[PDB]
Design an enzyme around this catalytic site. Structure first.
Site, PDB file in Angstrom:
ATOM      1  N   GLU A  12       0.901  -1.103  -0.005  1.00 28.25           N
ATOM      2  CA  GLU A  12       0.062   0.023  -0.028  1.00 28.25           C
ATOM      3  C   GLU A  12       0.872   1.240  -0.073  1.00 28.25           C
ATOM      4  O   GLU A  12       1.645   1.335   0.877  1.00 28.25           O
ATOM      5  CB  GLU A  12      -1.064   0.065   1.218  1.00 28.25           C
ATOM      6  CG  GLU A  12      -1.763  -1.240   1.316  1.00 28.25           C
ATOM      7  CD  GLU A  12      -2.875  -1.236   2.453  1.00 28.25           C
ATOM      8  OE1 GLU A  12      -3.559  -2.360   2.501  1.00 28.25           O
ATOM      9  OE2 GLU A  12      -2.613  -0.548   3.386  1.00 28.25           O
ATOM     10  N   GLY A  13       0.720   2.155  -1.075  1.00 27.95           N
ATOM     11  CA  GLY A  13       1.537   3.087  -1.139  1.00 27.95           C
ATOM     12  C   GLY A  13       0.953   4.269  -0.595  1.00 27.95           C
ATOM     13  O   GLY A  13      -0.041   4.272   0.382  1.00 27.95           O
ATOM     14  N   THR A  14       1.302   5.682  -0.570  1.00 24.54           N
ATOM     15  CA  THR A  14       0.650   6.839  -0.009  1.00 24.54           C
ATOM     16  C   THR A  14      -0.624   7.186  -0.638  1.00 24.54           C
ATOM     17  O   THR A  14      -1.283   7.750  -0.003  1.00 24.54           O
ATOM     18  CB  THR A  14       1.870   8.056  -0.396  1.00 24.54           C
ATOM     19  OG1 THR A  14       3.115   7.815   0.290  1.00 24.54           O
ATOM     20  CG2 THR A  14       1.131   9.568  -0.008  1.00 24.54           C
ATOM     21  N   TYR A  15      -0.602   6.985  -2.149  1.00 26.03           N
ATOM     22  CA  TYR A  15      -1.759   7.542  -2.976  1.00 26.03           C
ATOM     23  C   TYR A  15      -2.607   6.353  -3.203  1.00 26.03           C
ATOM     24  O   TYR A  15      -3.729   6.761  -3.824  1.00 26.03           O
ATOM     25  CB  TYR A  15      -1.313   8.296  -4.240  1.00 26.03           C
ATOM     26  CG  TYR A  15      -0.256   9.503  -3.937  1.00 26.03           C
ATOM     27  CD1 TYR A  15      -0.838  10.558  -3.007  1.00 26.03           C
ATOM     28  CD2 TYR A  15       1.030   9.094  -4.249  1.00 26.03           C
ATOM     29  CE1 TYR A  15       0.118  11.735  -2.915  1.00 26.03           C
ATOM     30  CE2 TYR A  15       1.804  10.203  -3.933  1.00 26.03           C
ATOM     31  CZ  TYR A  15       1.627  11.547  -3.277  1.00 26.03           C
ATOM     32  OH  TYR A  15       2.375  12.462  -2.748  1.00 26.03           O
ATOM     33  N   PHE A  78       9.378  -3.276 -12.604  1.00 27.80           N
ATOM     34  CA  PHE A  78       9.380  -3.975 -11.484  1.00 27.80           C
ATOM     35  C   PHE A  78      10.770  -4.451 -10.719  1.00 27.80           C
ATOM     36  O   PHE A  78      11.645  -4.774 -11.616  1.00 27.80           O
ATOM     37  CB  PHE A  78       8.602  -5.077 -11.715  1.00 27.80           C
ATOM     38  CG  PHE A  78       8.397  -6.165 -10.603  1.00 27.80           C
ATOM     39  CD1 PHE A  78       9.482  -7.078 -10.372  1.00 27.80           C
ATOM     40  CD2 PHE A  78       7.561  -6.144  -9.462  1.00 27.80           C
ATOM     41  CE1 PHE A  78       9.268  -8.110  -9.524  1.00 27.80           C
ATOM     42  CE2 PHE A  78       7.615  -6.751  -8.436  1.00 27.80           C
ATOM     43  CZ  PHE A  78       8.762  -8.001  -8.381  1.00 27.80           C
ATOM     44  N   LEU A  79      11.119  -4.165  -9.514  1.00 26.21           N
ATOM     45  CA  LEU A  79      12.213  -4.859  -8.683  1.00 26.21           C
ATOM     46  C   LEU A  79      11.616  -5.600  -7.725  1.00 26.21           C
ATOM     47  O   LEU A  79      10.416  -5.240  -7.114  1.00 26.21           O
ATOM     48  CB  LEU A  79      13.025  -3.443  -8.126  1.00 26.21           C
ATOM     49  CG  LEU A  79      13.979  -2.870  -9.566  1.00 26.21           C
ATOM     50  CD1 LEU A  79      13.210  -1.660  -9.986  1.00 26.21           C
ATOM     51  CD2 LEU A  79      15.278  -2.528  -8.740  1.00 26.21           C
ATOM     52  N   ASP A 123      10.216  13.423  -1.150  1.00 29.91           N
ATOM     53  CA  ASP A 123       9.922  12.571   0.038  1.00 29.91           C
ATOM     54  C   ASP A 123      10.543  11.245  -0.022  1.00 29.91           C
ATOM     55  O   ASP A 123       9.712  10.172   0.089  1.00 29.91           O
ATOM     56  CB  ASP A 123       8.277  12.309  -0.105  1.00 29.91           C
ATOM     57  CG  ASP A 123       7.722  11.591   1.011  1.00 29.91           C
ATOM     58  OD1 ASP A 123       8.171  11.675   2.143  1.00 29.91           O
ATOM     59  OD2 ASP A 123       6.640  11.159   0.905  1.00 29.91           O
ATOM     60  N   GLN A 127      11.691   3.028   2.034  1.00 29.98           N
ATOM     61  CA  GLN A 127      10.543   2.159   1.290  1.00 29.98           C
ATOM     62  C   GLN A 127      10.439   2.445  -0.142  1.00 29.98           C
ATOM     63  O   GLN A 127       9.847   1.675  -0.743  1.00 29.98           O
ATOM     64  CB  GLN A 127       9.456   2.591   2.043  1.00 29.98           C
ATOM     65  CG  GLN A 127       9.091   2.107   3.710  1.00 29.98           C
ATOM     66  CD  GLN A 127       9.904   2.949   4.278  1.00 29.98           C
ATOM     67  OE1 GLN A 127      10.365   4.128   4.443  1.00 29.98           O
ATOM     68  NE2 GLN A 127      10.753   2.348   5.274  1.00 29.98           N
ATOM     69  N   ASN A 128      11.009   3.811  -0.410  1.00 29.59           N
ATOM     70  CA  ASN A 128      11.018   3.820  -2.021  1.00 29.59           C
ATOM     71  C   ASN A 128      12.220   3.880  -2.630  1.00 29.59           C
ATOM     72  O   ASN A 128      12.450   4.489  -4.033  1.00 29.59           O
ATOM     73  CB  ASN A 128      10.230   5.201  -2.483  1.00 29.59           C
ATOM     74  CG  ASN A 128      10.409   6.697  -1.764  1.00 29.59           C
ATOM     75  OD1 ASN A 128      11.805   6.699  -1.424  1.00 29.59           O
ATOM     76  ND2 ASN A 128       9.633   7.642  -1.432  1.00 29.59           N
TER      77      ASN A 128
HETATM   78  N1  Z14 Z   1       8.304  -0.737  -8.663  1.00 30.41           N
HETATM   79  C1  Z14 Z   1       8.239  -1.767  -7.722  1.00 30.41           C
HETATM   80  O1  Z14 Z   1       8.665  -2.866  -8.110  1.00 30.41           O
HETATM   81  C2  Z14 Z   1       8.055  -1.205  -6.461  1.00 30.41           C
HETATM   82  C3  Z14 Z   1       6.947  -0.333  -6.494  1.00 30.41           C
HETATM   83  C4  Z14 Z   1       6.256   0.007  -5.176  1.00 30.41           C
HETATM   84  N2  Z14 Z   1       5.457   0.900  -5.009  1.00 30.41           N
HETATM   85  O2  Z14 Z   1       4.808   1.429  -5.933  1.00 30.41           O
HETATM   86  O3  Z14 Z   1       5.384   1.685  -3.917  1.00 30.41           O
HETATM   87  C5  Z14 Z   1       6.691  -0.738  -3.731  1.00 30.41           C
HETATM   88  N3  Z14 Z   1       6.414  -0.481  -2.611  1.00 30.41           N
HETATM   89  C6  Z14 Z   1       5.013  -0.666  -2.557  1.00 30.41           C
HETATM   90  C7  Z14 Z   1       4.395   0.171  -1.077  1.00 30.41           C
HETATM   91  C8  Z14 Z   1       5.314  -0.229   0.052  1.00 30.41           C
HETATM   92  N4  Z14 Z   1       4.866   0.507   1.162  1.00 30.41           N
HETATM   93  C9  Z14 Z   1       6.894   0.227  -0.433  1.00 30.41           C
HETATM   94  C10 Z14 Z   1       7.368  -0.419  -1.635  1.00 30.41           C
HETATM   95  C11 Z14 Z   1       7.662  -1.777  -4.019  1.00 30.41           C
HETATM   96  C12 Z14 Z   1       8.332  -2.328  -5.307  1.00 30.41           C
HETATM   97  N5  Z14 Z   1       9.117  -3.083  -5.442  1.00 30.41           N
HETATM   98  C13 Z14 Z   1       9.755  -3.838  -4.343  1.00 30.41           C
HETATM   99  C14 Z14 Z   1       9.189  -4.993  -3.744  1.00 30.41           C
HETATM  100  C15 Z14 Z   1       8.297  -5.935  -4.418  1.00 30.41           C
HETATM  101  N6  Z14 Z   1       7.472  -6.977  -3.870  1.00 30.41           N
HETATM  102  C16 Z14 Z   1       7.477  -6.838  -2.650  1.00 30.41           C
HETATM  103  N7  Z14 Z   1       6.647  -7.784  -2.223  1.00 30.41           N
HETATM  104  N8  Z14 Z   1       8.101  -6.056  -1.863  1.00 30.41           N
HETATM  105  C17 Z14 Z   1       8.848  -5.087  -2.290  1.00 30.41           C
END
Ligand code: Z14
Length: 294
Positions: A12-15, A78-79, A123, A127-128
Site C-alpha cells: 500500500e503506497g501513499t496514494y 518492477f524490482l 519525499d 521504502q521507495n
Molecule cells: N516498482 C516496484 O517494483 C515497487 C513499487 C512499489 N511501490 O509502487 O510503492 C513498492 N512498494 C509498495 C508500497 C510499500 N509501502 C513500499 C514498497 C515496491 C516495489 N518493488 C519492491 C518490492 C516488490 N515486492 C514486494 N513484495 N515488496 C517490495
C-alpha cells in the site's frame, strides 16, 4: 485493466494500492499503481507525463500513464525488494560497509541526474529505494510529490513519516530546493550505518527538536535568515551541537566529513549531489552483490 494479469499485491503506497502484474500482450512483468478526486486535475496529468522521458539507470522507469474512468494508473519497472525490508532483514549483522558505500554512490548519481533536469523528489525514504540481485539500487516516485502534494495521512489513514524531512520544510519555507533530497539521503545513510533511524520524530515539533538536540539549535551565524522563517519561534530551547563521532559510530572520518556536509542547516551551503560524488569517501568504491533470498 484487462491488459494486465494481477500476480499479487505488492503493498500500500501513499496514494493507492500497488500490484505486481504481467502485460498479457508482451509478457512484461511490471508494478501497477492506482492513484487517488472527482476526475483527476489536468495539471497533474501533464506534469506526470513529462516524467516518461526522465530515464537513467538509477531511476525506476515510468512505462505508461493511464487516465480512464476518472482513475489514474501508473505503470512502472518492477524490482523484487525495497531498502526498508532489506535493512530489517539485515538487522542482526548490518549491511557491509562496501555495500552501503555502493548504494550511496548510486543514489547520488540518480539525484545528480534528476536535479540537472530541474526535478526534485521531496519525499525520499527507505521504502521507495528499490534493489535487485545484480547490486543496483534505484529511486522510485521522483516528481509525484509536486504533482499530488505530500499528505498528512495515506489513503488508508496511515501516518506519512516525518523522519527524513529537511528542517527548512518544517520551519515553513514556501519554496523547495534540490537540497531537500540531499538532507533525506543523509538521514538514510546514517540509518544504514547505525541500524537505527537518526531522527525518529512522531510530530512536527518532535522532529524539529530531535534535529536541534543533535546538531544544535540553529542561529543567524550558521543559517542566515533562520529567525525570520514562517514557523520559527524565539522560544525554541537552545541545545548545544554534538560530535559526529558519537552520532554515527563507528564510521570513519571520510564518512563523517561527507555526512556533515549533507546535513548542513543552510540549504544554500548544503553539498550538491554532483559535488558529493567527488568526495574522498568514494575513492575505493566497488559494486558488491547483496544476499537476496526471493
Ligand atoms: N516498482 C516496484 O517494483 C515497487 C513499487 C512499489 N511501490 O509502487 O510503492 C513498492 N512498494 C509498495 C508500497 C510499500 N509501502 C513500499 C514498497 C515496491 C516495489 N518493488 C519492491 C518490492 C516488490 N515486492 C514486494 N513484495 N515488496 C517490495
Amino acid at each position: 485493466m484487462e491488459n494486465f494479469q494481477k500476480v499479487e499485491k505488492i503493498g500500500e503506497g501513499t496514494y493507492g494500492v500497488v500490484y505486481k502484474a504481467r502485460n498479457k500482450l508482451t509478457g512484461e512483468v511490471v508494478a501497477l499503481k492506482k492513484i487517488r478526486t472527482e476526475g483527476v486535475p489536468s495539471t497533474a496529468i501533464r506534469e506526470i507525463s513529462l516524467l516518461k522521458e526522465l530515464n537513467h539507470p538509477n531511476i525506476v522507469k515510468l512505462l505508461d500513464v493511464i487516465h480512464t474512468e476518472n482513475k489514474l494508473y501508473l505503470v512502472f519497472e518492477f524490482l523484487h525488494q525495497d531498502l526498508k525490508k532489506f535493512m530489517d532483514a539485515s538487522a542482526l549483522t548490518g549491511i557491509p560497509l562496501p555495500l552501503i558505500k555502493s548504494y550511496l554512490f548510486q543514489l547520488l548519481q540518480g539525484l545528480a541526474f534528476c536535479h540537472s533536469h530541474r526535478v526534485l523528489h521531496r519525499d525520499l525514504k527507505p521504502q521507495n529505494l528499490l534493489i535487485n540481485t545484480e547490486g543496483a539500487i534505484k529511486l522510485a516516485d521522483f516528481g509525484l510529490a509536486r504533482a499530488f502534494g505530500v499528505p498528512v495521512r495515506t489513503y488508508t489513514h496511515e501516518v506519512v513519516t516525518l523522519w527524513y524531512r529537511a528542517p527548512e520544510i518544517l520551519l515553513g519555507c514556501k519554496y523547495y530546493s534540490t537540497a531537500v533530497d540531499i538532507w533525506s539521503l543523509g538521514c538514510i545513510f546514517a540509518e544504514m550505518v547505525t541500524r537505527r533511524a537518526l531522527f525518529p520524530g512522531d510530530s512536527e515539533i518532535d522532529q524539529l527538536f530531535r534535529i536541534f538536540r543533535t546538531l544544535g539549535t540553529p542561529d543567524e551565524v550558521v543559517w542566515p535568515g533562520v529567525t525570520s522563517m514562517p514557523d520559527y519561534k524565539p522560544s525554541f530551547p537552545k541545545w548545544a551541537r554534538q560530535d559526529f563521532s558519537k552520532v554515527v559510530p563507528p564510521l570513519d572520518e571520510d564518512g563523517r566529513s561527507l555526512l556533515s556536509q549533507m546535513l548542513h542547516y543552510d540549504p544554500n551551503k548544503r553539498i550538491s549531489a554532483k559535488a558529493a560524488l567527488a568526495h574522498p569517501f568514494f575513492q575505493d568504491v566497488t559494486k558488491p552483490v547483496p544476499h537476496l533470498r526471493l
